[PDB]
Amino acid sequence: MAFRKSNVYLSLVNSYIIDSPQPSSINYWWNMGSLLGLCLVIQIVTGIFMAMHYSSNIELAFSSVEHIMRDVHNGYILRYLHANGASFFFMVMFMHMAKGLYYGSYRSPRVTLWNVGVIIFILTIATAFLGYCCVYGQMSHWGATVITNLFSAIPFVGNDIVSWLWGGFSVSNPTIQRFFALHYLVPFIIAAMVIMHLMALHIHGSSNPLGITGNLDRIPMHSYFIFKDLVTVFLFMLILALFVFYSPNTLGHPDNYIPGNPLVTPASIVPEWYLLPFYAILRSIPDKLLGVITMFAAILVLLVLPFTDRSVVRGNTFKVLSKFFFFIFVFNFVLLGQIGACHVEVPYVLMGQIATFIYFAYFLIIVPVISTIENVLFYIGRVNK
């Protein structure tokens, strides 16, 4: 046989990116996976070449970031690529998970793939939070303080857990040093989970935007989806180059260029832009413990998703009401982000509570009821009696 098939190392390259049978009807929404892989490689390479100049002391963190942006040759390129690419990493990941919810890729036989995806999502949120605290600006310090006090809400144990996390009594030098070590560490766990994700994908192949089988008309990976992914790679690099070179500090928060001061609290403490729906979910609950439980349940309710989709056809392509309520859900998630960006004021508390309820009601009540009604409507539309 061929050398790409008989060699031990090149057989994986073959069976994953050369001769992988892909369904020939998949559109550009089946390209966000390759795009996330490229953006992860961007994050790791800029992280290494920018962490060769970073000193993680609490008295030397912000000065070393400014040393990168001023004294290091092309260091502004590195930091701006790194932060804005983390923003694009979460945006492409949100689009990828929306592709997962829409076309029904979570359903059987792809439950393992969906669960490893949710694990990757949790690890990526953790990585972004740790790296945002490594800047040690104003928002970095106070966001670390608020999230660890949320961990202090745990009954009978929590204060000692938080003194363990801090490595002291408040967010201090051991906290920033261990956040830098963990933040260097967790992306390699993300890379291992990505390899496990690709294995759980490869044992059944991709889905298709129709929700029927794709075993009939398969076309290879090579040259077809290689050049289709190359198209979206160049578009992604174009938009990233715009938001790096022409308007770099748009997505960030301007308070992060104030150095970390434990005495001055800011006027409005807000995380970076993508953690705002989860921050709104947590802020909508009038309790600390129930708030933390609801914030983690807002990700575990993605795990309870394949067991509630009672639709007998895969994906929302050929269904009306499920497609409508899907876009209700997407614009609700955007409204959660925008509620979280605001203050704790009338009527944003009541709207945050209603928006959290519509989030959990979509994942727990709306999907099974609308899928059951859509099944019975498909049946009685064509069966006569």
Binding site: F49, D71, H73
Partner: protein
């Protein structure tokens, strides 16, 4: 261009090129004094010589040197 960016980001930064040169004063060092400084991460010996030390320097025969070299 990407390889240039990620490799030239590891070269000598701006502030370590700023301290590449020292500008020691000729009028401030006395005659019979040696000055030892840390320049460019290295020690540098500085001496104001007398003309008799010049005459002693340029009149030693080259065969007494394993690497012969004139004073100028």
């Amino acid at each position: 261009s990407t390889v240039e960016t990620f490799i030239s980001s590891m070269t000598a930064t701006a502030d370590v090129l700023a301290m590449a040169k020292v500008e020691v004063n000729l009028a401030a060092i006395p005659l019979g004094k040696n000055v030892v400084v840390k320049w460019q991460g290295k020690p540098v010996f500085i001496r104001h010589r007398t003309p008799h030390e010049i005459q002693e320097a340029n009149s030693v025969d080259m065969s007494a040197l394993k690497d012969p070299q004139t004073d100028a």
